[model samples]
Target: APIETDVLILGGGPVGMALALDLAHRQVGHLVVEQTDGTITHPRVGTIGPRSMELFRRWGVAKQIRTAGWPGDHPLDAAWVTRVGGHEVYRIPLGTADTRATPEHTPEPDAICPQHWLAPLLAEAVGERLRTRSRLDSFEQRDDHVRATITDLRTGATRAVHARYLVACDGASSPTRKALGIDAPPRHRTQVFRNILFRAPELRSLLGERAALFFFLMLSSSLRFPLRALDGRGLYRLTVGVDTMDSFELVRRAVAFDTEIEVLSDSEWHLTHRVADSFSAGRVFLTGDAAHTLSPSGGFGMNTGIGSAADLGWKLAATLRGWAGPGLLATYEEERRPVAITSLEEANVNLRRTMDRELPPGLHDDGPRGERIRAAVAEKLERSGARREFDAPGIHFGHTYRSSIVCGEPETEVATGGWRPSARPGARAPHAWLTPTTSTLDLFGRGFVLLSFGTTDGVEAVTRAFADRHVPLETVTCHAPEIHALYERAHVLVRPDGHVAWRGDHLPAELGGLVDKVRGAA
Candidate 1:
């Protein structure tokens, strides 16, 4: 029997599953095809950003993610060290999960659930919508819908799936992207690195007080890459520039402890920074590593993909729900391509900081000279803002959307004065506590939200305009003076994705024009 769904999602990785989860929240039917059984073999992504967490919160998985067994007591710090158990050159003391203060900018903090742990959680959340042992062999885009041929590997049967849209989330070497004839041009030179996943059962106990999520080994100039904690316990992964070293010996040198060191796997991987020339071609769209593959230096790769999914999810729901105009679907590429480009460039900047740094020869020597060299290098790391890679709220929460759907912002303008979260058009609707348990963001996601700090004369007029057009609208009145002042506008319209679409002190008389423009009628 032929399967039909509203959306056909290729690949079952974090990004694809994220899109499925978002669509599920909107009650949009989707089918996710993945060749593998959704088990992560070589887990790469480590941390989830605060903004991504907010999206997960809307999906009802934020609490599960927080308790996903990253030891609450484990240090969330990043350290530059000679070895895991050896001298630490410098430490960005981010404090343990239990000790870290909540960021005022968002209600949620970043989670350290690694890819292996995270994949299962997401798969469970997406449930029956995610189809394992399935592969999308081919797809053809039509003016009204997409026709795809999917192979059920379990049965060796080819099944036809007719979908309203197809999204590609199929990793760096996306066949779907190739089939679309769209190229992802490299913005920076590619680099090869070896990732060693190992189990050092007693390693955590050895480094008890000096624990950190990431350890930058200054063993040699070329050997400088992150030794990351896959879990706060026994699992770890070490990324190095060369692949010739014995995995056991490499783990021994990196971990200054004589623990049960069992090398699980050593995989050779290439890091490339590229954003797709186009995010969409007809009824098919590219997302995740399929849309942009960037350096994993700052763990931006997966987070950026998840962010793109959130952006695309709501637009897709609206378009399918009959309230969206023809232009709504087109704005996905216009709004997201720039963000992918921005994140790719920023990730490369982080990669270059480590790659270009010249490691001093005698920094590891045990002498007065060694101490001085270590001090100098530590100072340099601090001065270079190496900690920015781990603690980046700017990259996660600061990207503003610019498109035809967003009104009142200049066509090319971006917020330049530093990101403090405001309800300005195109910016992420700033966070404010509506009650002890609720947030300003919680009011969005389900529909277009109209925020009035107080009763405004033109509120009913604007409401009638969208209501008359069968547009989904939610109106809320807020009394928090501090929050109203922070928003800086009495009337603020926020999109389903939590971005402020339009804002002003008072509603303009041209309510219908604003409604039409925001709903894609214009």
Candidate 2:
């Protein structure tokens, strides 16, 4: 049997589902296939980055994700202690979700939704378009379409699919990428770690006065791991460093108790710093972990995948709708591949920092010597900037696209904290709050948005020029003093993806030419 679809997405994980949501919102038809039954066994991701939250807001799931049982009143602080019941050594104060005021740059802030809850919510959003218990057995790509063999696990039935584009989101061990003969060269040596999901019914109650959202255990040399609240309920997960122990022994050490404990599941995962040499092969394209896999030290792996999916979604829709230029589709890898590699390197740096820290045995004991050690470690943490591992706005929104479509002023030189944002071509538009409830980001969705400040002179001509090509353009005039100050310029043209395409104090002489160049029509 054979079926046909515009875009066939392999893997129904968060990244794949995010792509489906993006395509569906653009009125593009897509089908998602998953090998396993649509059930989340072990929840991996616990925190959603702020930029991802903005995308979820656009997708209409931000509220549901925010309210999905992670207590709003629970402390957001991540603390490092000798043990759950032992002495506290270091702490990073993270304000509660509700108490933390929203950043002026983005309308939506990050939310905590463990993968188990997040997976089903994403699956529900994708609806029947997601085919569970279906695996892509084999696939072959032609000039314009990919022919794939899929197996329905429940009924053991095989079916063929011919899709205009085949997106391989099949995860870290991507068979699709392997099948296409793409090499994902590792950027660093692989490290093994054990993730143990266990239920601690009494542990929460026992914490009495020292309760925290996440506890990084610095107990024994072998047990220094991150013990985090997986679902805010009794569910919790401990990421144990597997230096030499086997899986079962690692799980035992992770619990830190000789008493009865229900180990829900324990799995070992290899942390790799790898980005595929190519993200696309003929008609087949790799997204999510299939394209690039990175260390989870900074919790950037899934977020990067979702961002790549969004980048590809818009271009794919444009191409399929007959409005995209010839080279537009090819720019997907060119634009996103670099971002993936940068994120991989950034995450590895965070991991190396954590690994290199020396822990003193006496740091666990409460005495003058322990206090001195604690103070020394605190000083080291301050110098090391370990907090940046968790709080990274640059990694999320700082990524800029340099491709054929972008048209703006040539880059000069500027620097801000590790990232630079300018009116230069392809930079992510500088964030600004246009109103009490709106961000400059909110103005961009369907197509290009021209933001004019102070005055709207010559803006109508620019809009008309783009409209002549049937390009969707919205001209938003803002008088907010704060927003004007933040933009530092009058006229800025933002792309559909919320990146600054071009900006200047005055309109270009050839407004039509600028539009054509920015939209890839030139």
Model 2 weakest 10-residue run by lDDT:
412-421
How would you encode candidate 1's per-residue C-alpha lDDT over 319-366 as one tens digit per residue? 899988888888888888888888888888888998888888797888
Give the 10-residue window scoring lowest on summed lDDT in candidate 1: 410-419
Candidate 2, residue 1: how far the Cα is off, in Å: 5.8
Instruction: Give the lDDT of residue 420 in candidate 1.
Output: 69
Per-residue error at 328 for model 1, in Å? Answer: 1.0
Give the TM-scores of the predictions, in the order they appear: 0.97, 0.94
The sequence of per-residue lDDT tens digits that candidate 2 reaches over residues 155-268 is 999999999999999999998888878899888999888788888777666776566777877666657768888777688787876665555565455444454456788878
Which is the leading candidate under TM-score?
1
lDDT at 399 for candidate 1?
A: 82
